[PDB]
Short mmCIF file of C-alpha atoms and ligand atoms in Angstrom, two decimals:
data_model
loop_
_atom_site.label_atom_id
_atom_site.label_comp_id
_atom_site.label_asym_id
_atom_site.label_seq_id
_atom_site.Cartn_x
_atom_site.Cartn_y
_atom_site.Cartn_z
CA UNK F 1 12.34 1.58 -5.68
CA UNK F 2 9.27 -0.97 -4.57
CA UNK F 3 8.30 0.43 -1.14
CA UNK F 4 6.76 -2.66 1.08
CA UNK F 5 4.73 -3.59 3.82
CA UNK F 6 3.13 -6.62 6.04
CA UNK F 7 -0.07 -6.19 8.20
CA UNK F 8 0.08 -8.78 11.01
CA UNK F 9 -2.25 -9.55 13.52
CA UNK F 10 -2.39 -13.01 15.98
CA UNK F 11 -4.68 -15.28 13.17
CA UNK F 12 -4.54 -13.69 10.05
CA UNK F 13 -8.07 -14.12 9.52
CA UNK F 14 -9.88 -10.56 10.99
CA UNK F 15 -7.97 -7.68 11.14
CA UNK F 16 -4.78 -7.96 8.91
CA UNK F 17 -6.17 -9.24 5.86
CA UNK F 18 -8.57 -6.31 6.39
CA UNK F 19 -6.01 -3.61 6.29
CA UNK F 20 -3.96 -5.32 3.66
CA UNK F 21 -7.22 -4.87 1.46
CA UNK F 22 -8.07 -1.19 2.27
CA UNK F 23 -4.27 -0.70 1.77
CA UNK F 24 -4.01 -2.22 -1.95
CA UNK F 25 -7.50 -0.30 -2.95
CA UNK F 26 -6.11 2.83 -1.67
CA UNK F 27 -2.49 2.20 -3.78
CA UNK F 28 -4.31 1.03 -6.78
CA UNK F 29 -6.93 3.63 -6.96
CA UNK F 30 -3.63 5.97 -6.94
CA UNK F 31 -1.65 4.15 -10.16
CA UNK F 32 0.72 3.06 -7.62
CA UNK F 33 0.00 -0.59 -7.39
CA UNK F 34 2.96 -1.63 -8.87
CA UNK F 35 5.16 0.16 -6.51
CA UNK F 36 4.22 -1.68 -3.54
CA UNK F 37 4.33 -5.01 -2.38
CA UNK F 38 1.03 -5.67 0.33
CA UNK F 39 0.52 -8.23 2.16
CA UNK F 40 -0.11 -9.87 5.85
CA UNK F 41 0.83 -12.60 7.94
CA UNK F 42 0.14 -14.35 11.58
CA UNK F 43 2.01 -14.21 14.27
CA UNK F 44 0.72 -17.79 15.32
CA UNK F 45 -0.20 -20.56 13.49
CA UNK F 46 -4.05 -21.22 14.46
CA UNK F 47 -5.46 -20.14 11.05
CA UNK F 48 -2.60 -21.37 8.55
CA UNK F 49 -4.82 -21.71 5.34
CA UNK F 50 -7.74 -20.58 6.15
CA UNK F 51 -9.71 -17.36 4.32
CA UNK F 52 -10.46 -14.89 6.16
CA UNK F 53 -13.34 -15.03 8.86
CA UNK F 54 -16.37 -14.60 6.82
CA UNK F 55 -17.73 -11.80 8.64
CA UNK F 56 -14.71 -9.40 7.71
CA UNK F 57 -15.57 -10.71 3.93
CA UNK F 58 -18.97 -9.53 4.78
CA UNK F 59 -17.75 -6.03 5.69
CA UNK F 60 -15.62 -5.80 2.74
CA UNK F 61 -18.05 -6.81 0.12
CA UNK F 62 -20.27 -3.84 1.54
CA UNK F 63 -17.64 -1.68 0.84
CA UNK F 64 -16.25 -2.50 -2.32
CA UNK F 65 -12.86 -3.10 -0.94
CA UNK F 66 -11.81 -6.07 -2.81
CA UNK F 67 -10.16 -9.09 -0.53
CA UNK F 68 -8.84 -12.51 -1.52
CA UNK F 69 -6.48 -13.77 0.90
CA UNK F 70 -5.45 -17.52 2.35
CA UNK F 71 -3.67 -16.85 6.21
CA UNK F 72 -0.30 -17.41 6.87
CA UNK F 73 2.37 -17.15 9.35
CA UNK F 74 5.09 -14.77 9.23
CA UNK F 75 8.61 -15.99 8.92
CA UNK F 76 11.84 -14.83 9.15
CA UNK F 77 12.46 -13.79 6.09
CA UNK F 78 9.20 -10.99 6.22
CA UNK F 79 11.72 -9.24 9.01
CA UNK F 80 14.64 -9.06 5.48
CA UNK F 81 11.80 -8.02 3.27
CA UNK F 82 9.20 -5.78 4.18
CA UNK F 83 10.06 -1.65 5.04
CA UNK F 84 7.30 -2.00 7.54
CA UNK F 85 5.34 -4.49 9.82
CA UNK F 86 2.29 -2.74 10.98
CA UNK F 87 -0.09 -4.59 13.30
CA UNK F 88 -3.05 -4.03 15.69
CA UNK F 89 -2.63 -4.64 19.27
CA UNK F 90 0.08 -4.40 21.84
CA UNK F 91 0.06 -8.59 22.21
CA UNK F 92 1.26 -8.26 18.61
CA UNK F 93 3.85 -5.44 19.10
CA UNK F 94 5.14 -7.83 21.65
CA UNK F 95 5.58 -10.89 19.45
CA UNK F 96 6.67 -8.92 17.01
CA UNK F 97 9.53 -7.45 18.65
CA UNK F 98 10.61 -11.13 20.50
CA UNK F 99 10.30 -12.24 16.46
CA UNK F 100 12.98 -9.48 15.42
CA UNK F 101 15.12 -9.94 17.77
CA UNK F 102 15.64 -13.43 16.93
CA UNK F 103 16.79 -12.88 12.98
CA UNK F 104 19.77 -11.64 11.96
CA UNK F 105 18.54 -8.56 9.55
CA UNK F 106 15.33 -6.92 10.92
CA UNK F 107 14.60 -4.07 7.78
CA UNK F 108 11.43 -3.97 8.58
CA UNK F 109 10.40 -0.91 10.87
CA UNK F 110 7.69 -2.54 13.40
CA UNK F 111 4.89 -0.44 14.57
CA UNK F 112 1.05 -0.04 15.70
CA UNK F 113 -0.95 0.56 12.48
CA UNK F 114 -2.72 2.58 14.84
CA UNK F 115 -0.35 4.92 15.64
CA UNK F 116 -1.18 6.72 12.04
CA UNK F 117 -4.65 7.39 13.14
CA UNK F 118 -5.27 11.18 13.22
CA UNK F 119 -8.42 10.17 15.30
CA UNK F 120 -5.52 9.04 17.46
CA UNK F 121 -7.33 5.57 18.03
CA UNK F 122 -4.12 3.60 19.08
CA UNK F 123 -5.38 -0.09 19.21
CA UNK F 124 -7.52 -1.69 16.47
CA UNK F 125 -9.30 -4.05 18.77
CA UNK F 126 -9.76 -7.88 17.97
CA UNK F 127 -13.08 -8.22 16.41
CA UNK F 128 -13.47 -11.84 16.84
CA UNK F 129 -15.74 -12.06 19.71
CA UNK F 130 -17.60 -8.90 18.69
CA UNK F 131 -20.64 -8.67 15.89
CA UNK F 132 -20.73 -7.23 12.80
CA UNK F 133 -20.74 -3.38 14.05
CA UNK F 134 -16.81 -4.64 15.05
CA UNK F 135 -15.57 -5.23 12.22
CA UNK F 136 -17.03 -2.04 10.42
CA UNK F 137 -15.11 -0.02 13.26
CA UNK F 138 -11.93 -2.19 12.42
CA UNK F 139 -12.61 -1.35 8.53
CA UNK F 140 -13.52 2.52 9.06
CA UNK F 141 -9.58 2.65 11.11
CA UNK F 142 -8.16 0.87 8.77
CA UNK F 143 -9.18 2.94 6.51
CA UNK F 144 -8.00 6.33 8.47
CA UNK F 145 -4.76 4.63 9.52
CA UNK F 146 -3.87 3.24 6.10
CA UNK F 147 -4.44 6.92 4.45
CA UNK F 148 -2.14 8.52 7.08
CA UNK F 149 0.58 5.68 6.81
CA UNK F 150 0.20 5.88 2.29
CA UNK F 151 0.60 9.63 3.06
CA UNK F 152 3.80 9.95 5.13
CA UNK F 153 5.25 7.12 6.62
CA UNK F 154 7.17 7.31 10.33
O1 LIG A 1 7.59 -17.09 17.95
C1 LIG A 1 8.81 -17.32 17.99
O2 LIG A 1 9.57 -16.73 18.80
C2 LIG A 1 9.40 -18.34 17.03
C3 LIG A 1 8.93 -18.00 15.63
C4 LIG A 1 7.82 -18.64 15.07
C5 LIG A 1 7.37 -18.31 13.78
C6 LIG A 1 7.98 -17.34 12.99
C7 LIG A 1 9.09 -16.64 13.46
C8 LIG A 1 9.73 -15.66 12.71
C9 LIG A 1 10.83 -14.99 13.23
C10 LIG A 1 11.33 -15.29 14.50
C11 LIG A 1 10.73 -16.26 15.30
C12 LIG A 1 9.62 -16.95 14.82
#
């Protein structure tokens, strides 16, 4: 069976589309590809069609993790879809949860991507009005947290 999951944050411009990349390198370096549907979505609707912000590009082209992405906002059908929503910050969790609550079938299990660190860093803090050295520590969790959550989910 396809096993699924949507990384959210507020813009869908910094940190989800970052995750969702690490996430897809990490399944597709394993065979697994295939077996998973990635992807990630806004909670708002600032960014709707925009790439991501060009300094998380930045970051990922240094790392080899590829990214191609075009931001959009969740909808009510994501709650149906996806096994998991897994998103940064507890303004999230909150929208997330008023979101669910307001659809009819909620699959999806909602939860901190953080929460699978075993550095046990619980928030993956907004980047946008930090520099560069932000978004590497927003790729380098990702990166711990989407290992962990590939490994054994909650
Ligand atoms: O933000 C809101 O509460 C309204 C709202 C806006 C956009 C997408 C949604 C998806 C599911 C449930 C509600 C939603």
């Amino acid at each position: 069976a396809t096993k699924s999951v949507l990384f959210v944050c507020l813009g869908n411009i910094c940190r989800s589309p970052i995750a969702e990349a690490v996430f897809r390198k990490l399944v597709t370096d394993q065979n697994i590809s295939e077996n998973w549907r990635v992807d990630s979505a806004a909670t708002s609707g600032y960014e709707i069609g925009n790439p991501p912000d060009y300094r998380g590009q930045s970051c990922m082209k240094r790392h080899g993790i590829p990214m191609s992405h075009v931001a959009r906002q969740i909808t009510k059908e994501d709650f149906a879809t996806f096994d998991y929503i897994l998103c940064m910050d507890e303004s999230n969790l909150r929208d997330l949860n008023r979101k669910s609550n307001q659809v009819k079938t909620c699959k999806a299990k909602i939860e901190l991507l953080g929460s699978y660190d075993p550095q046990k860093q619980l928030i993956i803090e907004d980047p946008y009005y930090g520099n560069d050295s932000d978004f590497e520590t927003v790729y380098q969790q990702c990166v711990r947290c989407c290992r962990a959550f590939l490994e054994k989910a909650h």
